[PDB]
Amino acid sequence: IVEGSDAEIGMSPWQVMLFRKSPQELLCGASLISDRWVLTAAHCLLYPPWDKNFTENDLLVRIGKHSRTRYERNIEKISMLEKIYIHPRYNWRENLDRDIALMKLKKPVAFSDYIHPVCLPDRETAASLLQAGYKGRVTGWGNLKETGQPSVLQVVNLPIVERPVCKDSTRIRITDNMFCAGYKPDEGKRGDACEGDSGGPFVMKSPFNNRWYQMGIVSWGEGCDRDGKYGFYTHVFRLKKWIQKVIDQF
């Protein structure tokens, strides 16, 4: 997260940290959507261009965290993966279309003050909030500058951007399963996701029922917080049906 601030305790009870067993290091962000499933970006697990291809027994899931490097005893919970599921049509060859993956936990996690699931959007909620100008929130332990890390969980609020503006800012072919966000060069404010925030949640608070919904997943960008450039996210509602599918089958 670039130009964000320290999250306050329990501010994102669904934030998940994908942790590598060996060497012990941060891998990606992710989110808790139930007591048995965490959502993340597919490129966090599979990306042939860098020979990255992780399996279940390769990672650990750490939920309820705030600090980036400390083992927050009695607060955080570490869970093992039972099965990973990448979207069959995930396009790592071209533009990272359908960058999404589901992870089934070995054992149901016990909720608490620091561990709680976020909501998945329905057609109505997405249609009301997913509009240009509307701000959303991104969180993660990723880098603070394009080219040190944070000590504590970071967070920024960014506005959703008009599709046309998104298209005219890159050479990468933009699809319907994506959407971009960030401030324009003349808007004064700034901020963005960055290396290490991948898989993290982009959420919005519904003004109708007061709940938080995850509308996007940190997918990709060109650099970090550069003028005229925007961060791109996986459109969660567009992939909602694949999600329900995977969940009632397994």
């Binding site: 942790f19 067993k21 012990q24 290091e25 027994n57 650990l60 490097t69 400390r70 083992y71 093992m80």
Partner: peptide, 10 residues
């Protein structure tokens, strides 16, 4: 990163 307990390595 601070080391995590071994009982979580399966």
């Amino acid at each position: 990163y601070e080391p995590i307990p071994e009982e979580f390595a399966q």
